[PDB]
């Protein structure tokens, strides 16, 4: 979890809370996606919205599939191997873009690249294909960079 930002670490805490609220006995890709969409002003959320995807629409489609469990375990809810894979893919996606940090945008790209999980299935069906979201990530950051250079020009 070394290079995780405050916001990228809060998405994993909210994943544990989302699993607990639904009384699930596991943290899957679904809970990392439900964690992510709390951060409405981050690059991940802004990337999806700029592709005409709505956050509460993502929530409804994830929740319809995964349902509700019997009872959350009393201790830590265990991450699934694919949930672990999403987090590993997120930290390999950051360097490839030339980023010195793991942000909400890398977790979104991790969820999509994982490919097999509920998160990837929901996002792909809403038109959140990997290369399309990557391009949107890059354009948003380049777009933010230009606005802040205008600011900087006092």
Author numbering: 2 to 155
Original paper wording:
Since single mutations at sites Leu92 and Leu96 of ClpC1 caused a reduced binding affinity for ECU, the crystal structure of an engineered double mutant was solved to investigate the mechanism of resistance. Since the L92S mutation had a lower affinity for ClpC1-NTD, it was chosen for the double mutant. This C=O bond protrudes out of the helix axis and is at an approximate hydrogen-bonding distance from NH2 of Arg4. Accordingly, the L96P mutation apparently does not have a significant effect on the length of helix 6 as both the ClpC1-NTD-L92S/L96P and ECU complex structures terminate this helix at residue 97, while some other structures terminate at position 98. However, in ClpC1 the L96P mutant confers ECU resistance, as do the L92S and L92F mutations. As shown in Fig. 3(b), it was observed that the double mutation L92S/L96P introduced a kink in helix 6 and replaces a hydrophobic residue (Leu) with a more polar Ser.
ClpC1 is a 95 kDa caseinolytic AAA+ protein with an N-terminal domain (NTD) and two nucleotide-binding domains (D1 and D2). The NTD (amino acids 1–145) has been studied extensively to determine the most critical residues for the binding of ClpC1 to several natural cyclopeptides with potent anti-TB activity.
